Symmetry: C3
Subunit: 261 residues, 3 copies
């Protein structure tokens, strides 16, 4: 049962961290690990694999670690790594970390990801606030009887708080696709026609599950590339990884400052 | 085998209703269930749970009802309560009511549903004829070697007969999505771009199955809410049940008067 | 009844071994998959040195179309040894995508560097005629599926090699190109769905190819895609044609396109 597995996970988290309740959770995606160094000093770090119901992250740069971090009056559950629908897991396992974080007390989820830019004026390494999403997976993490409203799924209030730390932050609609193949240029033109600004392979189900469980969501993409058929700056793979790591390191400090309110 | 479970269901329907043949079937959506109280004078009520093929092996709670209702010269099979794709069951169970009804002689399927309104002229509590659909589920109820042309899937002839009962009935394109989450405002703007007037969580597979089985389809949406991000108010299942309950007597009357014209 | 879930790479290796043994050819550098309406193309490719039933190869689900569909032919074309798969299986038949893309993976394991993937399609774009062959410039995968599993990534830029389209147009410079929308099927589209597909940039609509292209690119093969327009899509206006006119136009185009592919492959 998803709710009971979430309650068991939250019990182990409380016991292993010695913290009764974490009021904020952060899921770090691909390219986001460098944010850890700037978020704060962890009081506990443990493998996700030792938590009930957690399929260990396997994607390159997903540590598969949970960090407990004090940030002002807040106790922040940091999930360094997530699992993806393209790994073949039932969506109940994909959204279990978010349900476990809610059961551990998290009222606000920061969901981070890597994304393709669908606009030629986005830059590799640019952080982009998620204004909304397009679920283009033909799936839901919810079952019969769970009829959840996704108006303001990405809290306007949280984007406003982020812009108090960096008022220049861009925003965009994130298209969640199944993957794991990348898009054809014709698919990228279609996504622009459907009103998407960003493309990736996570987040939409985690957002739906977070809203169904009564949590507010702040979504942040790191643009790792311009999407198929959009020509962008000639960068080496080292320049792409370096630009991403520098933004992820800066965004850790920004998230710490925003969470601290 | 879907066709054989349909045939066995039709045999039991004939035996328990004492009616050899039903020429019309009505599927009542969430938001149309209360209309069963106001749709003619039912002579027989059968539990779907006692009919072959109706309940998925891992079905949740109690199955629905089937009623036999005389409406004009017609004997109507009314399916009160249905299986949705969002419950996770094979689409054979979503479309079994349509296939069982066809095997019992139904040449016309009235498929009803609740919908979010996208087109500006469509109001909460308005019945809307379905002109066409967008299947946005990436699924089909048909298996290999079952082909069907979906040109005029929603019989123009039946929409014209409905308009003899109420000549001001609007019509719109219905987008069938998986659900059960409601849409983001961004997804609603996308659906407007793709030409949807209505959004919901049923019907598209039942329509495909009906056409494949040789039945004509009338689709009727009740607008239970404006689509996400139009008012800015959140959406709830309570709105669908509330709009259905309030409209039940009107919608029952409409379905009776339209079916009488078939 | 149970699906054994064989490992794709090993099933492809074993299939390529049986293909080498039964054809007496160690390597096939080109593969051709002939879709619906494409059987007339077979004779113009050349004289086959081996013909065998697909069903006798490991991992091959037999195509449902019988006769000369469901065959593998080994055909010499210039300096090349060409693996011709007459018929395919479809996602609508309900099989796991590993079976849908297994023929392409088996062909790659037998040495195929280039895949020619042909299909039937409905025409959306105003200029397209029933019977017209159309080069695939790009695709829209509208199935919400992938034939790739966790950790397998592929860039689908130029999935349909511009080089191979240019070689096809050297053999017949009037060949049109268009974007193929791959749908699950097996129902055909409503007119409203077809107006949607036009908005999303599709010129052609069918029930195959997209997963085979993804699997081909992931395995390192170049792809040439060709649609035969068998019908105008739902709601698309055109001259009324009889069933006989439609079928005859297709068969004559398939014959010509067989000769064109023989000439193009000789220049690969
Ligand atoms: O162009 C692009 N198309 C589609 N997806 C992307 C991504 S995200 C991505 C891609 C492959 C694997 C994992 C990914 O994300 C993991 P997560 O951060 O969401 O946990 C970047 N660029 C593109
Ligand atoms: O705005 C909307 N978006 C998407 N679906 C809807 C529905 S339908 C619906 C909603 C909740 C639960 C079940 C529903 O369908 C059952 P049925 O009537 O088709 O049997 C109304 N409004 C919207
Ligand atoms: O209008 C159309 N809509 C959608 N699909 C089509 C097809 S393809 C097709 C249809 C039924 C069965 C199989 C099919 O594909 C065979 P293949 O050549 O890809 O192996 C033609 N016309 C339309």
């Amino acid at each position: 049962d998803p709710d009971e597995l979430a309650r068991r996970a939250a019990q182990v988290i409380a016991d292993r961290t010695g913290i009764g309740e974490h009021d904020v959770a952060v899921v770090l995606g691909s390219g986001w690990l460098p944010a850890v160094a700037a978020l704060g000093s962890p009081t506990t770090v443990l493998p996700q694999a030792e938590l009930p119901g957690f399929v260990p992250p396997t994607a390159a740069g997903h540590a598969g670690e949970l960090l407990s971090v004090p940030i002002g009056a807040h106790r922040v559950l940091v999930l360094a790594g997530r699992i993806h629908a393209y790994e073949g897991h039932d969506l109940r396992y994909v959204v279990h970390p978010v349900r476990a974080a809610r059961a551990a007390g998290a009222q606000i989820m920061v969901l981070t990801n890597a994304a393709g830019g669908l606009r030629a004026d986005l830059q590799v390494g640019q952080p982009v606030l998620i204004s909304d999403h397009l679920n283009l997976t033909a799936r839901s993490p919810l079952v019969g009887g769970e009829f959840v409203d996704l108006t303001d799924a990405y809290s306007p209030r949280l984007r406003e708080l982020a812009r108090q730390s960096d008022p220049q932050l861009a925003e965009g609609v994130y298209a969640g696709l199944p993957g794991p193949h990348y898009e054809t240029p014709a698919e990228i033109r279609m996504l622009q026609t459907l009103g998407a600004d960003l493309v990736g392979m996570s987040t939409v189900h985690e957002t739906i599950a977070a809203r169904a469980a009564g949590a507010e969501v702040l979504g942040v993409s790191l643009v790792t590339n311009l999407a198929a058929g959009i020509t962008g700056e000639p960068l080496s793979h080292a320049e792409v990884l370096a630009a991403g790591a520098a933004s992820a390191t800066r965004m850790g400090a920004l998230l710490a400052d925003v969470i601290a309110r």
